[PDB]
Amino acid sequence: PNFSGNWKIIRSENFEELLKVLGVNVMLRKIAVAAASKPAVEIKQEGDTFYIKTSTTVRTTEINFKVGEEFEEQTVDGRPCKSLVKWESENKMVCEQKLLKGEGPKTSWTRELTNDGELILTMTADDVVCTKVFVRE
Ligand SMILES: CC1=C(/C=C/C(C)=C/C=C/C(C)=C/C=O)C(C)(C)CCC1
Ligand code: NA
Ligand code: NA
Ligand code: NA
């Protein structure tokens, strides 16, 4: 597959519930959920090397990783973590995350290119799964 491109959101589910289980107060959540409903995503992939930029009106993240190599990033709520991405299947990556400090919900994410040309991002905290679906811009 090639994830490379600019991606636009077409569906979001369960992002408020995800932030809820992470313990974000309703007021800050409200700012976040609205902004996260319109994220713009740029991916540059060369083989196992990835750059992913996710931009919203309230927060932008930029990560560089290589599939199979540990790296440091932040959880969806900004907590520093170490992460490892692997290919779960041909067009699907899964990232497992461990907090650098302290105790917290177990978090992960997955990104998959689907047969129809879309991209599915999932983000999980404990049991709660957020799904966001994108199409190329
Ligand atoms: C403003 C703000 C937040 C916003 C988070 C957002 C907007 C996350 C968007 C995530 C997306 C689009 C992920 C795609 O991979 C936090 C950190 C929850 C709480 C602190 C204040
Ligand atoms: Na990430
Ligand atoms: Na994020
Ligand atoms: Na999944």
Swiss-Prot record:
Interacts with RXR and RARA. Interacts with importin alpha. The gene is CRABP2. GO terms for biological process: embryonic forelimb morphogenesis; epidermis development; fatty acid transport; positive regulation of collateral sprouting; regulation of DNA-templated transcription; retinoic acid metabolic process; signal transduction. Transports retinoic acid to the nucleus. Regulates the access of retinoic acid to the nuclear retinoic acid receptors. Forms a beta-barrel structure that accommodates hydrophobic ligands in its interior. GO terms for molecular function: cyclin binding; fatty acid binding; retinal binding; retinoic acid binding; retinoid binding; retinol binding. CDD domains: CRABP2 (cd19461). It comes from Homo sapiens. Pfam families: Lipocalin. GO terms for cellular component: cytoplasm; cytosol; endoplasmic reticulum; extracellular exosome; nucleoplasm; nucleus. Belongs to the calycin superfamily. Fatty-acid binding protein (FABP) family. All-trans-retinoate binds at K132, V133, F134. This is Cellular retinoic acid-binding protein 2. Keywords: Cytoplasm, Endoplasmic reticulum, Isopeptide bond, Nucleus, Retinol-binding, Transport, Ubl conjugation, Vitamin A. Sumoylated in response to retinoic acid binding, sumoylation is critical for dissociation from ER and subsequent nuclear translocation. It is found in: Cytoplasm; Endoplasmic reticulum; Nucleus.
